[PDB]
Amino acid sequence: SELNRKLVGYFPEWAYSSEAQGYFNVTDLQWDSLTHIQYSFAMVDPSTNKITLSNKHAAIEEDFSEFDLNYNGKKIELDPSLPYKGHFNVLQTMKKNYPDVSLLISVGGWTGTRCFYTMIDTDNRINTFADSCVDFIRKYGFDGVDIDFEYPSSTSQSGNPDDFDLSEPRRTKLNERYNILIKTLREKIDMASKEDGKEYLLTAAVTASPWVLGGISDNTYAKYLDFLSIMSYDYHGGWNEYVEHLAGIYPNKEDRETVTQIMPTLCMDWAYRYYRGVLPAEKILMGIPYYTRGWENVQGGINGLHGSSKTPASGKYNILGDDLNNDGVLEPAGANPLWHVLNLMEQDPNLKVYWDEISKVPYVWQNDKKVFVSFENEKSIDARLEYIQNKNLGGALIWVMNGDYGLNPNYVEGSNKINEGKYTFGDTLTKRLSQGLKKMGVCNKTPDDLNISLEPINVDVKFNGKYDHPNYTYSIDITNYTDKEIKGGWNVSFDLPKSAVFKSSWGGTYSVTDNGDFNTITLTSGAWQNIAPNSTITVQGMIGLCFSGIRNVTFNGMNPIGN
Ligand SMILES: [Cl-]
Ligand SMILES: [Cl-]
Ligand code: NA
């Protein structure tokens, strides 16, 4: 059952009362197509270090008397026998008719990560938080916990700048403490599963940014997750000048932001290769956006793409813009749900859609106003399905579910009101994904690393290093725990994810052999590099770009099992 394809959707707690979000509530979720629903979002309490609700009223108090709760044309009433109302009541009520859809509480996000920084400071606070997550999923009928820490990285000035006062003093330890957090959550959740006779889940949404990942050395935490959701979006946007795709699939040598790097990194497939260092494909999910980012007054490019702009798209091209000071004056971002862009194209014949066959995503370009907005449509869904099948991926996650589209019951011909266009939210793309995931069948089980099938040798191989972008300097310690000297000319091999390129060994010689999502690096030492019994020898070299970890380590054609 763990090899089943997954279609994971984030539910926005905030949407049901917001015009720009379409007033999307739980009865608008794509229940027939999703396998998992991630409730966005919970946080960590600053004083108790326990899981806590963001909008408590929305989550457990709202009666929706002023809103339209209906599903399949039938009015949905809150279950009066539950001791809470809100979204959580509607979720549990719907779950009765969709018992195989898993519900998870997502903790964190861009604005909910702040108190993670102080909670991870001590093991007792981590224990308190993990225990509180168990209490919470029991109380509210959740099937698991999703951790969306943005970001547990040493990279200076990553994460929300509002939190620099907490993150910057902690950079050197965040990755280590995050690994303890995830491991502790797994331990507590597994115990609760046994106690309750339920199979509770632990998942995480994780960065796809090479910049953030340069400060994330230990990715062992991934092995404690039921699945790892790659946030393969927000690659490009109004924060800089590069008019490029929000969520490209394949590496694009024409992406101006990375044209000089050793390979194009701002695409799903680069992050896939990165995380293959620690996970099989069937535990990795592709992130899919149902929103846009964009620019206006675009200079150069072709249909805007690969042009430049210092002015993100504004006005009707930015209905999801953040309102920083409640003026109704939204920060330019070119950010829209997909249905709004469809409505804009109904009204403007010169707002046209184009296809990028390299990145395999669409984009929208207004040639008179010079407006470029990223996009997502049936063609990109089909390309994403092909990728998921080709790579044996676990499936996809969607950010956020109210951006999919369908026909609007409140359509008014000629209206420019946000919720009176031809389209509103719907399930067009999500149903198409679900159908394609069904058609391709379950994932294959990725075989174990081949090294475990080899004869053992009592040699310990330890791979460490330091990243100074774009250079990874590795140091490998090889300890001979046998009772005989190992002669020089020994070789060690390891599989290096194709997110990185082996550059040089500083001693001996090396070969590079293609091995799927990896290159097998074989380092052959010189005759003088004898390893005495109970002694350690260290070799170094250089790798370009970063990687989640290395795999399939061998020594002299055998499995190094250390001591
Ligand atoms: Cl179901
Ligand atoms: Cl297209
Ligand atoms: Na394709």
Coordinates of C-alpha atoms and ligand atoms in Angstrom, one line a residue:
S1 CA 0.0 0.0 0.0
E2 CA 3.0 2.3 0.6
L3 CA 3.8 2.0 -3.2
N4 CA 0.4 3.5 -4.2
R5 CA 0.7 6.8 -6.0
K6 CA 0.0 9.8 -3.9
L7 CA -1.9 13.0 -4.8
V8 CA -1.5 15.3 -1.8
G9 CA -3.3 18.6 -1.6
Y10 CA -2.8 21.6 0.8
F11 CA -6.0 23.0 2.2
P12 CA -5.9 26.7 2.9
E13 CA -7.4 27.5 6.3
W14 CA -7.6 31.2 5.3
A15 CA -9.4 30.9 2.0
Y16 CA -13.1 30.5 3.0
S17 CA -13.6 34.2 4.0
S18 CA -11.4 35.8 1.3
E19 CA -12.7 37.1 -2.0
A20 CA -9.3 36.7 -3.8
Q21 CA -9.2 33.1 -2.6
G22 CA -12.7 32.3 -3.9
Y23 CA -14.2 31.6 -0.5
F24 CA -12.9 28.0 -0.9
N25 CA -13.9 25.8 2.1
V26 CA -13.6 22.1 2.9
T27 CA -16.6 21.1 0.8
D28 CA -14.8 22.5 -2.2
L29 CA -11.8 20.1 -1.8
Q30 CA -11.3 17.6 -4.6
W31 CA -12.2 14.7 -2.4
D32 CA -12.7 12.2 -5.3
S33 CA -9.1 12.8 -6.5
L34 CA -6.8 13.5 -3.6
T35 CA -5.3 10.7 -1.6
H36 CA -4.0 13.0 1.2
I37 CA -5.1 16.4 2.5
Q38 CA -2.5 18.6 4.3
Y39 CA -4.2 21.2 6.5
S40 CA -2.4 24.5 6.2
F41 CA -1.3 25.4 8.8
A42 CA -0.5 24.9 12.5
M43 CA 2.4 26.5 14.4
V44 CA 4.5 26.1 17.5
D45 CA 3.4 28.1 20.6
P46 CA 6.1 30.6 21.7
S47 CA 5.5 29.8 25.5
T48 CA 4.5 26.2 25.7
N49 CA 6.4 24.8 22.6
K50 CA 3.2 22.8 21.8
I51 CA 1.5 22.5 18.4
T52 CA -1.1 25.4 18.2
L53 CA -3.6 26.6 15.7
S54 CA -3.1 29.7 13.6
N55 CA -6.8 30.7 13.0
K56 CA -8.4 28.8 15.8
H57 CA -11.9 30.2 14.8
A58 CA -11.6 28.9 11.3
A59 CA -10.2 25.5 12.4
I60 CA -12.6 24.6 15.2
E61 CA -15.3 27.2 15.8
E62 CA -16.7 28.5 12.5
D63 CA -20.3 27.3 12.0
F64 CA -20.3 28.5 8.3
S65 CA -23.8 29.8 8.7
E66 CA -22.9 32.6 6.3
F67 CA -21.2 30.3 3.8
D68 CA -22.1 27.6 1.3
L69 CA -21.3 24.1 2.6
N70 CA -22.5 21.7 -0.2
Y71 CA -21.0 18.7 -1.9
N72 CA -22.4 16.8 -5.0
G73 CA -25.2 19.3 -4.9
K74 CA -26.3 18.3 -1.4
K75 CA -26.1 20.6 1.6
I76 CA -23.4 19.5 4.1
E77 CA -24.3 20.1 7.7
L78 CA -21.7 20.1 10.5
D79 CA -21.8 16.9 12.5
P80 CA -23.5 18.0 15.7
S81 CA -22.1 15.1 17.7
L82 CA -18.5 16.3 17.5
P83 CA -17.1 18.6 20.2
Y84 CA -15.8 21.1 17.7
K85 CA -17.0 23.0 14.6
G86 CA -14.8 24.7 12.0
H87 CA -12.9 23.2 9.1
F88 CA -12.0 20.3 11.3
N89 CA -15.6 19.3 11.7
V90 CA -16.3 19.5 8.0
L91 CA -13.1 17.4 7.3
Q92 CA -14.3 14.7 9.7
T93 CA -17.8 14.8 8.3
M94 CA -16.6 14.5 4.7
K95 CA -14.1 11.8 5.7
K96 CA -17.0 9.5 6.6
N97 CA -17.8 9.3 2.8
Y98 CA -14.1 9.3 1.9
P99 CA -12.5 7.0 4.5
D100 CA -9.4 6.3 2.5
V101 CA -8.4 9.9 2.1
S102 CA -5.7 10.6 4.7
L103 CA -5.7 13.9 6.7
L104 CA -2.5 15.5 8.0
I105 CA -1.9 18.6 10.0
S106 CA 0.9 20.7 8.4
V107 CA 3.0 22.6 10.9
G108 CA 5.1 25.6 9.8
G109 CA 5.1 27.3 6.4
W110 CA 6.5 30.7 5.5
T111 CA 4.7 32.5 8.4
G112 CA 4.5 29.6 10.9
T113 CA 8.1 28.6 11.2
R114 CA 9.1 31.2 13.8
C115 CA 8.7 29.3 17.0
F116 CA 10.3 26.1 15.6
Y117 CA 13.7 27.9 16.1
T118 CA 13.3 28.1 19.9
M119 CA 11.4 24.8 20.2
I120 CA 14.4 22.9 18.7
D121 CA 16.8 24.4 21.2
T122 CA 16.5 21.5 23.7
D123 CA 15.5 17.9 23.6
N124 CA 12.8 18.4 26.3
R125 CA 11.2 21.1 24.1
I126 CA 11.3 18.7 21.1
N127 CA 9.8 16.0 23.2
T128 CA 7.0 18.3 24.4
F129 CA 6.3 19.4 20.9
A130 CA 6.2 15.8 19.5
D131 CA 4.0 14.6 22.4
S132 CA 1.6 17.5 21.7
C133 CA 1.4 16.5 18.0
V134 CA 0.3 13.0 19.0
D135 CA -2.3 14.5 21.4
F136 CA -3.5 16.8 18.6
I137 CA -4.0 14.2 15.9
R138 CA -5.9 12.0 18.3
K139 CA -8.1 14.8 19.4
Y140 CA -9.0 16.1 16.0
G141 CA -9.0 12.8 14.0
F142 CA -5.9 13.4 11.9
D143 CA -3.9 10.6 10.3
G144 CA -0.5 12.2 10.6
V145 CA 1.8 15.2 10.8
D146 CA 3.5 17.2 8.0
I147 CA 6.5 19.3 9.0
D148 CA 7.1 22.4 6.8
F149 CA 10.1 24.1 8.5
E150 CA 11.2 27.0 6.3
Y151 CA 14.1 26.4 6.6
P152 CA 16.4 24.2 8.8
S153 CA 19.5 25.5 7.0
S154 CA 22.7 27.2 7.9
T155 CA 22.4 29.4 4.8
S156 CA 22.6 32.9 6.1
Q157 CA 19.4 35.0 5.5
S158 CA 17.3 32.0 4.4
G159 CA 13.8 31.6 5.6
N160 CA 11.5 34.4 6.6
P161 CA 13.4 37.7 7.3
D162 CA 11.0 38.5 10.1
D163 CA 12.6 35.5 11.9
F164 CA 16.3 36.4 11.4
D165 CA 16.5 37.4 15.1
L166 CA 15.9 33.7 15.9
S167 CA 17.4 31.9 12.8
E168 CA 20.6 33.8 12.4
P169 CA 22.1 33.0 15.9
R170 CA 21.2 29.4 15.3
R171 CA 22.5 28.7 11.8
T172 CA 25.3 26.3 12.7
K173 CA 23.0 23.9 14.6
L174 CA 19.7 24.1 12.7
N175 CA 20.3 21.1 10.5
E176 CA 21.5 18.9 13.4
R177 CA 18.5 19.9 15.6
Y178 CA 16.0 19.4 12.8
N179 CA 17.3 15.9 12.3
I180 CA 16.6 15.2 16.0
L181 CA 13.2 16.8 15.7
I182 CA 12.1 14.6 12.8
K183 CA 13.5 11.4 14.4
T184 CA 11.8 12.2 17.7
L185 CA 8.5 12.8 15.9
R186 CA 8.8 9.4 14.2
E187 CA 9.5 7.7 17.4
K188 CA 6.5 9.2 19.2
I189 CA 4.1 8.8 16.3
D190 CA 5.1 5.1 15.8
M191 CA 4.3 4.5 19.5
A192 CA 1.0 6.2 19.2
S193 CA 0.2 4.1 16.1
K194 CA 0.8 0.9 18.1
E195 CA -1.2 2.1 21.0
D196 CA -4.2 3.2 18.9
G197 CA -4.2 0.4 16.2
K198 CA -3.8 3.1 13.5
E199 CA -1.1 3.8 11.0
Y200 CA -0.1 7.4 11.6
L201 CA 2.0 9.3 9.1
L202 CA 4.9 11.7 9.3
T203 CA 5.8 13.7 6.2
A204 CA 7.7 16.9 5.3
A205 CA 7.6 19.6 2.7
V206 CA 11.2 20.5 1.8
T207 CA 13.2 23.0 -0.1
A208 CA 14.2 22.6 -3.7
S209 CA 16.5 25.6 -3.6
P210 CA 20.3 24.9 -4.1
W211 CA 21.0 28.1 -2.1
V212 CA 19.0 26.8 0.9
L213 CA 20.3 23.2 0.4
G214 CA 24.0 24.4 0.5
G215 CA 23.4 24.8 4.2
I216 CA 21.7 21.4 4.8
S217 CA 24.4 18.7 5.1
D218 CA 22.6 15.9 6.9
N219 CA 19.5 14.6 5.1
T220 CA 19.1 11.4 7.2
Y221 CA 15.8 12.8 8.4
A222 CA 14.3 11.9 5.1
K223 CA 14.4 8.2 5.9
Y224 CA 12.0 8.8 8.8
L225 CA 9.3 10.1 6.5
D226 CA 6.5 8.3 4.8
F227 CA 7.1 10.7 1.9
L228 CA 9.2 13.7 1.1
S229 CA 7.4 16.6 -0.7
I230 CA 9.7 18.6 -2.9
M231 CA 8.6 22.2 -3.1
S232 CA 9.5 22.4 -6.8
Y233 CA 7.9 25.8 -7.3
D234 CA 8.8 29.4 -6.4
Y235 CA 11.9 28.9 -8.5
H236 CA 11.4 32.3 -10.1
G237 CA 9.3 35.4 -9.2
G238 CA 9.1 39.1 -8.6
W239 CA 12.0 39.1 -6.1
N240 CA 14.5 39.4 -9.0
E241 CA 14.7 40.4 -12.6
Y242 CA 14.8 36.9 -14.3
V243 CA 11.6 36.4 -16.2
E244 CA 11.6 32.6 -16.0
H245 CA 9.4 29.7 -15.0
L246 CA 7.9 29.3 -11.6
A247 CA 8.0 25.5 -11.6
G248 CA 9.9 24.1 -14.6
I249 CA 10.2 20.3 -14.7
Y250 CA 13.4 19.7 -16.7
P251 CA 16.8 21.6 -16.7
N252 CA 16.7 24.6 -19.0
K253 CA 20.1 25.8 -20.3
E254 CA 18.3 29.1 -21.3
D255 CA 17.3 30.0 -17.7
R256 CA 19.2 33.2 -17.4
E257 CA 19.6 33.0 -13.7
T258 CA 21.7 29.8 -13.9
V259 CA 23.3 30.1 -17.4
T260 CA 26.8 30.2 -16.0
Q261 CA 26.4 27.4 -13.4
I262 CA 27.7 23.9 -14.1
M263 CA 24.1 22.8 -14.6
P264 CA 20.6 24.3 -14.5
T265 CA 19.3 23.8 -10.9
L266 CA 15.9 25.7 -10.8
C267 CA 13.7 22.8 -11.9
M268 CA 12.1 19.8 -10.3
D269 CA 14.4 17.3 -11.9
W270 CA 17.5 18.8 -10.3
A271 CA 15.9 18.5 -6.8
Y272 CA 14.9 15.0 -7.7
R273 CA 18.5 14.0 -8.3
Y274 CA 19.5 15.9 -5.2
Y275 CA 17.2 13.9 -2.9
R276 CA 17.9 10.5 -4.6
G277 CA 21.0 10.5 -2.4
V278 CA 18.9 9.6 0.6
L279 CA 15.5 8.4 -0.8
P280 CA 14.1 6.1 -3.5
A281 CA 12.0 7.8 -6.1
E282 CA 8.8 6.2 -4.8
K283 CA 9.1 8.2 -1.5
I284 CA 9.6 11.5 -3.4
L285 CA 6.7 13.7 -4.5
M286 CA 6.7 16.4 -7.2
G287 CA 5.4 19.8 -6.1
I288 CA 2.9 21.4 -8.4
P289 CA 1.7 25.0 -8.2
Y290 CA -1.9 26.1 -8.9
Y291 CA -0.9 29.8 -8.7
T292 CA 1.3 32.1 -10.8
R293 CA 4.1 34.6 -10.4
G294 CA 4.9 37.2 -13.0
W295 CA 6.3 40.5 -14.2
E296 CA 5.1 43.6 -16.1
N297 CA 7.1 46.0 -18.3
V298 CA 9.2 43.0 -19.4
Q299 CA 12.2 43.9 -21.5
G300 CA 13.6 41.6 -24.1
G301 CA 13.0 37.8 -24.1
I302 CA 10.8 36.0 -26.5
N303 CA 7.1 36.2 -25.6
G304 CA 8.6 37.6 -22.4
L305 CA 10.4 34.4 -21.5
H306 CA 14.1 34.9 -20.6
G307 CA 13.5 38.7 -20.5
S308 CA 14.1 41.0 -17.6
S309 CA 11.9 43.1 -15.3
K310 CA 12.3 45.0 -12.1
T311 CA 8.5 45.4 -11.7
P312 CA 6.4 42.4 -10.7
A313 CA 3.0 42.3 -12.3
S314 CA 0.4 44.3 -10.4
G315 CA -3.3 45.1 -10.5
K316 CA -5.6 42.6 -12.1
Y317 CA -2.5 40.4 -12.7
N318 CA -1.9 40.0 -8.9
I319 CA -5.1 39.2 -7.1
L320 CA -3.2 37.0 -4.6
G321 CA -0.7 39.8 -3.7
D322 CA 0.0 40.2 0.0
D323 CA -1.7 43.2 1.7
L324 CA 1.2 44.5 3.8
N325 CA -0.7 47.3 5.6
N326 CA -4.4 46.5 5.0
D327 CA -4.7 49.4 2.5
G328 CA -6.0 47.1 -0.1
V329 CA -2.7 48.0 -1.8
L330 CA -1.2 44.6 -2.7
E331 CA 2.5 44.0 -3.0
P332 CA 3.2 43.3 -6.7
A333 CA 4.0 39.6 -7.4
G334 CA 2.1 38.6 -10.5
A335 CA 0.3 36.1 -8.2
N336 CA -3.0 34.6 -9.3
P337 CA -5.0 31.4 -9.0
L338 CA -5.2 29.6 -12.3
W339 CA -8.9 30.2 -12.7
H340 CA -8.4 34.0 -12.6
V341 CA -5.8 33.9 -15.4
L342 CA -8.3 31.9 -17.4
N343 CA -10.9 34.6 -16.8
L344 CA -8.4 37.3 -17.8
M345 CA -7.8 35.5 -21.1
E346 CA -11.6 35.4 -21.7
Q347 CA -11.6 39.2 -21.4
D348 CA -8.4 39.9 -23.4
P349 CA -7.7 38.2 -26.7
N350 CA -4.1 39.4 -26.5
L351 CA -3.3 37.6 -23.3
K352 CA -2.1 34.4 -24.9
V353 CA -0.7 31.0 -23.7
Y354 CA 2.5 29.5 -24.9
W355 CA 4.3 26.2 -24.3
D356 CA 8.0 25.7 -23.3
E357 CA 9.0 22.2 -24.6
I358 CA 12.3 22.3 -22.7
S359 CA 10.9 23.0 -19.2
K360 CA 7.5 21.5 -20.2
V361 CA 5.4 24.2 -18.6
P362 CA 3.2 26.8 -20.1
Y363 CA 3.3 30.6 -19.7
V364 CA 1.0 33.6 -20.5
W365 CA 2.2 36.7 -22.3
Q366 CA 0.5 40.0 -23.0
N367 CA 2.6 41.5 -25.9
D368 CA 1.1 45.0 -25.7
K369 CA 1.4 45.5 -21.9
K370 CA 4.6 43.3 -21.7
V371 CA 3.2 41.1 -18.9
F372 CA 4.5 37.6 -18.3
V373 CA 2.8 35.2 -15.9
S374 CA 3.7 31.6 -15.2
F375 CA 1.0 29.1 -15.8
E376 CA -0.1 25.5 -15.4
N377 CA -2.5 23.6 -17.7
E378 CA -3.5 20.2 -19.1
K379 CA -0.4 20.0 -21.1
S380 CA 1.9 20.6 -18.2
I381 CA -0.1 18.1 -16.1
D382 CA 0.5 15.6 -18.8
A383 CA 4.2 16.3 -18.8
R384 CA 4.2 15.9 -15.0
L385 CA 2.4 12.6 -15.3
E386 CA 5.0 11.4 -17.8
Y387 CA 7.8 12.4 -15.5
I388 CA 6.2 10.7 -12.5
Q389 CA 5.8 7.5 -14.4
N390 CA 9.3 7.7 -16.0
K391 CA 11.1 8.3 -12.6
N392 CA 8.9 6.0 -10.5
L393 CA 7.9 9.0 -8.3
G394 CA 5.6 8.5 -5.4
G395 CA 3.2 11.1 -6.8
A396 CA 2.6 14.9 -6.4
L397 CA 1.7 17.5 -3.9
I398 CA -0.3 20.6 -4.8
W399 CA 0.1 24.1 -3.5
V400 CA -2.7 25.2 -3.0
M401 CA -6.0 23.4 -3.8
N402 CA -8.2 26.5 -4.5
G403 CA -6.2 27.4 -7.6
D404 CA -7.5 24.5 -9.7
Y405 CA -10.4 25.5 -12.0
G406 CA -13.9 24.7 -13.1
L407 CA -17.0 26.4 -14.2
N408 CA -18.4 29.3 -12.0
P409 CA -22.0 29.0 -10.8
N410 CA -21.8 32.8 -10.2
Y411 CA -20.6 33.7 -13.7
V412 CA -21.9 37.1 -14.9
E413 CA -21.2 37.9 -18.6
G414 CA -19.1 41.0 -18.9
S415 CA -18.3 41.2 -15.2
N416 CA -14.8 42.1 -14.0
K417 CA -15.5 41.0 -10.4
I418 CA -13.0 38.3 -9.2
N419 CA -15.7 35.7 -8.5
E420 CA -18.0 36.5 -11.4
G421 CA -15.8 35.2 -14.3
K422 CA -16.4 32.2 -16.4
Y423 CA -14.2 30.1 -14.1
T424 CA -13.8 29.7 -10.4
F425 CA -12.0 27.0 -8.4
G426 CA -12.7 23.4 -9.5
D427 CA -11.0 20.0 -10.0
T428 CA -10.0 20.0 -13.7
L429 CA -6.3 19.6 -13.3
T430 CA -6.5 17.6 -10.1
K431 CA -8.9 15.0 -11.6
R432 CA -6.6 14.8 -14.6
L433 CA -3.7 14.1 -12.3
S434 CA -5.7 11.5 -10.4
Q435 CA -6.7 9.7 -13.6
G436 CA -3.2 9.6 -14.8
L437 CA -1.8 8.3 -11.5
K438 CA -4.4 5.6 -11.6
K439 CA -3.6 4.6 -15.2
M440 CA 0.2 4.3 -14.6
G441 CA -0.3 1.9 -11.7
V442 CA 1.6 1.5 -8.4
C443 CA 5.3 2.4 -8.0
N444 CA 8.0 -0.2 -8.2
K445 CA 10.1 -1.0 -5.2
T446 CA 13.5 0.4 -5.8
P447 CA 16.1 -2.3 -5.0
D448 CA 18.6 -1.9 -2.2
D449 CA 22.1 -0.5 -2.8
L450 CA 24.1 -3.2 -4.4
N451 CA 26.9 -2.9 -1.8
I452 CA 24.9 -4.8 0.7
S453 CA 24.9 -7.9 -1.6
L454 CA 28.8 -7.9 -1.6
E455 CA 31.1 -9.9 0.7
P456 CA 31.8 -7.9 3.9
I457 CA 35.1 -6.4 4.9
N458 CA 35.9 -4.9 8.3
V459 CA 36.8 -1.5 6.9
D460 CA 35.0 1.7 7.9
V461 CA 34.4 4.3 5.2
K462 CA 33.2 7.7 6.5
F463 CA 32.3 10.5 4.0
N464 CA 32.4 14.1 5.2
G465 CA 33.0 17.5 3.7
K466 CA 32.3 21.2 3.5
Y467 CA 30.3 23.2 1.0
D468 CA 31.5 26.6 -0.2
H469 CA 29.2 27.3 -3.1
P470 CA 29.7 26.0 -5.8
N471 CA 32.5 23.7 -4.4
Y472 CA 32.1 20.7 -2.2
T473 CA 35.4 19.7 -0.6
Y474 CA 35.1 16.1 0.5
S475 CA 37.2 14.2 3.1
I476 CA 36.9 10.4 3.3
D477 CA 38.3 8.6 6.3
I478 CA 39.1 4.9 5.7
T479 CA 39.8 2.8 8.8
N480 CA 41.2 -0.7 8.6
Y481 CA 39.6 -2.8 11.3
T482 CA 41.1 -6.1 9.9
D483 CA 44.2 -7.7 11.4
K484 CA 46.3 -7.3 8.2
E485 CA 47.7 -4.2 6.5
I486 CA 45.7 -3.2 3.4
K487 CA 48.2 -2.5 0.6
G488 CA 48.2 0.7 -1.3
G489 CA 46.3 0.6 -4.5
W490 CA 43.0 -0.2 -2.8
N491 CA 39.9 1.6 -4.2
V492 CA 36.8 3.0 -2.7
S493 CA 33.6 3.7 -4.7
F494 CA 30.5 5.7 -3.9
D495 CA 27.5 6.8 -5.8
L496 CA 27.2 10.6 -6.2
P497 CA 23.8 12.0 -7.1
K498 CA 23.6 13.7 -10.5
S499 CA 22.7 17.0 -8.8
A500 CA 26.5 17.3 -8.5
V501 CA 29.6 16.7 -10.7
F502 CA 32.7 15.0 -9.5
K503 CA 35.6 17.4 -10.3
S504 CA 38.9 16.0 -8.9
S505 CA 40.6 13.6 -6.5
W506 CA 43.5 15.0 -4.6
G507 CA 45.7 11.9 -4.8
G508 CA 45.6 8.7 -6.7
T509 CA 43.3 8.4 -9.8
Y510 CA 39.6 8.2 -10.4
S511 CA 36.9 7.0 -12.8
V512 CA 33.3 8.1 -13.3
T513 CA 30.7 5.6 -14.4
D514 CA 27.1 6.5 -15.2
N515 CA 24.7 4.7 -12.8
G516 CA 21.2 5.9 -13.3
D517 CA 20.4 8.9 -11.0
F518 CA 24.0 8.7 -9.9
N519 CA 27.6 8.6 -11.1
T520 CA 29.7 5.9 -9.5
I521 CA 33.0 7.5 -8.4
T522 CA 35.9 5.1 -8.1
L523 CA 38.9 6.4 -6.3
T524 CA 42.1 4.2 -6.7
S525 CA 44.8 5.0 -4.2
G526 CA 48.6 4.9 -4.8
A527 CA 50.8 2.1 -3.7
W528 CA 52.2 4.1 -0.8
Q529 CA 48.8 4.6 0.8
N530 CA 49.0 1.5 3.0
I531 CA 46.4 1.3 5.8
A532 CA 47.8 -0.4 8.9
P533 CA 45.6 -2.3 11.3
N534 CA 43.5 -0.1 13.5
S535 CA 44.7 3.0 11.5
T536 CA 42.9 5.6 9.5
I537 CA 43.8 7.1 6.1
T538 CA 42.1 10.2 4.7
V539 CA 41.6 11.2 1.1
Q540 CA 40.2 14.5 -0.2
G541 CA 38.9 16.0 -3.4
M542 CA 36.4 18.3 -5.0
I543 CA 32.8 18.0 -6.2
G544 CA 30.7 20.7 -8.0
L545 CA 27.3 21.6 -6.5
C546 CA 25.6 19.8 -3.7
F547 CA 23.8 16.5 -3.0
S548 CA 21.7 15.1 -0.2
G549 CA 24.1 12.3 0.5
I550 CA 26.1 9.5 -1.1
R551 CA 25.1 5.9 -1.5
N552 CA 26.4 2.4 -2.3
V553 CA 29.9 2.7 -0.8
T554 CA 32.2 -0.1 -1.6
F555 CA 35.9 -0.9 -0.8
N556 CA 38.0 -3.2 -2.9
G557 CA 34.8 -4.7 -4.3
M558 CA 33.4 -5.5 -0.9
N559 CA 30.9 -4.0 1.5
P560 CA 32.7 -1.9 4.2
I561 CA 31.0 -2.9 7.4
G562 CA 33.5 -1.1 9.7
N563 CA 34.0 -2.6 13.1
Ligands
CL1 CL -12.1 7.1 0.0
CL2 CL 0.1 25.3 -23.9
NA3 NA 6.5 14.6 -22.2

